[PDB]
Write a protein that binds this ligand. Structure first.
Ligand code: HMG
Ligand code: MG
Lengths: 296, 296
């Protein structure tokens, strides 16, 4: 049955902002994050210590992590694509980092010119350094419900890559459907295989709403026992490998579904909505949250 | 568990066009319906034989029903609020009519201007005529998951009304979540109470996507065994007398989910999308179908 509590992983200021056409000032990023903490979120992916030469929207990573209020008990993980970035994250005060891979060979090769297996070597240093520093590492597997290049992805393959991340030291791995082509059965089959090798509590899903399947795919995940899901404030985000259609599952809409289900989230919807409106105005875009649209 | 086949009841030409300030021309309405016939839907709610006073957008019901092409196999149900309307429906060639009430007293008052018991009177008169003519009758129970006026609605209340419509002669009854405030748990409870009194085959769900819960609310129903669901093309819709009524689950996003689940619908997605694009340009609005947006 459904879990009693769900840990929402707010990715809006990171995954969301990274995939937005307009960029926002550093103070705006900081305000948004402070507003998400005040909304009650347990974890808020803050930024990415990535070469400003490859992704400018995240250029203020250092000053952002250092500028945000650190609410008691709230986690503020940051992406570290390589060892240099990991080092910059540590020096800036990061206590948790996120590394990423894919369950698809084609996707991996087109992105870093190496196989899935080879893509892990890049982490070994990060993984060992993080351990020597008492720093938590979150894993992420994209193409979990399908790949824009290979198409359908085998559950067994997703289970193998998640397993690898898990045994390498990732305390939690988030399964992603960034192109958003997944449907309930695909989610089910994938989770079923992954749960064989990895303990349920170490799992999370990150569904994009590109095809309007995000919430439905998420509920299936919840039905399978998963208790941590990723979402972006007001549906902020998008995928470079897909068309016009939106990106991330809207946090407010997920919260609305969980409150209705009587599932504890510890999030104040009213305040969450305020955060959503703030960043949307600063980004000059209409919210992608249906709850937001209907409420005001 | 999940049915191998689902009968999608397309309501775009009625419920979809119903709440729309700028009236649509008769030829456009006719054109939308033939295009939907083209896409392969097996049921298309054509129009409402109701007073032009309450809903003028539907005032051309007579000519619309007469002008559309009657494809082989496809059904073209039309709303009939009373014997007066049912009268004009049969004269216009209707092979199936739809009576509509609610589990809410206030909403009944404000929608069809009468009490719940009183609507049972009108309907009983319609079912009387229908039987002797073999003109099948479908029923609607609005506010199945809450009322914008009375708030919480009980599963027992919805089951009671549904039971009434069923015992009087309705072959099928659609449980419409008018304002889209429902969440999976609420949907499951309502369906369970209803299933005790009325057989599954005669049940259908009609979910609005005001809060982004339509697809997920619908998946819950499919898991409960319901095999017929209502939806509108480009996610158009909203009851003019529900207050705050947003669009209906987008038919394109529903077929995408079903096809994903390997569930037969008999609908041609590409052609459905064309129909969606057609009506949208006609209303001069952006489609609400996520799928349509990811296509181009
Ligand atoms: C029930 C009544 C009759 C109210 O009844 P009443 O207004 O209280 O008065 P009445 O019954 O004595 O007569 C009404 C007036 O309508 C006329 N009339 C009646 N039928 C016709 C006709 N065919 N052609 C020409 N005129 C007609 C009639 O001639 C008269 O006019 P007057 O002489 O004063 O001008 C109806 O008019 C009404 O209230 N309609 C509202 C429309 C409505 O209910 N729309 C919502 C559709 S349902 C929905 O959206 C929910 C659903 C299905 O989508 C699923 C879900 O979400 O749950
Ligand atoms: Mg409706």
């Amino acid at each position: 049955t459904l879990p009693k509590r769900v840990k929402i992983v707010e990715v809006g200021p990171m995954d969301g902002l990274q995939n937005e056409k307009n960029i926002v000032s550093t103070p705006v990023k900081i305000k948004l994050i402070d507003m998400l903490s005040e909304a009650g979120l347990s974890v808020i992916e803050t930024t990415s210590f990535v070469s400003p030469k490859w992704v400018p929207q995240m250029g203020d990573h250092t000053e952002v992590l250092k500028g945000i209020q650190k609410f008691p008990g709230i986690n503020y993980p940051v992406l570290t694509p390589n060892l240099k970035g990991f080092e910059a994250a540590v020096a800036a005060g990061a206590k948790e980092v996120v590394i990423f891979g894919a369950a698809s060979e084609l996707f991996t090769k087109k992105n870093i010119n190496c196989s899935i297996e080879e893509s892990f070597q890049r982490f070994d240093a990060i993984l060992k350094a993080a351990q020597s520093a008492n720093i938590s590492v979150r894993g992420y597997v994209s193409c979990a419900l399908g790949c824009p290049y290979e198409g359908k992805i085998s559950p067994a393959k997703v289970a193998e890559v998640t397993k690898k991340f898990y045994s390498m030291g990732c305390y939690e791995i988030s399964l992603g459907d960034t192109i958003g082509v997944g449907t309930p059965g695909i989610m089910k089959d994938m989770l079923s295989a992954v749960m064989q090798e990895v303990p349920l509590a170490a799992l999370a899903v990150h569904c994009h709403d590109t095809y309007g399947q995000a919430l439905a795919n998420t509920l299936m995940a919840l039905q399978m026992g998963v208790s941590v899901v990723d979402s972006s404030v007001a549906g902020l985000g998008g995928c470079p490998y897909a068309q016009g259609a939106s990106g991330n599952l809207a946090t407010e809409d997920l919260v609305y579904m969980l409150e209705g289900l009587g599932i504890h989230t510890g999030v104040n919807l009213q305040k969450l909505l305020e955060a959503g409106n703030f960043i949307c105005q600063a980004l000059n875009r209409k919210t992608s949250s249906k709850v937001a649209q209907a409420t005001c």
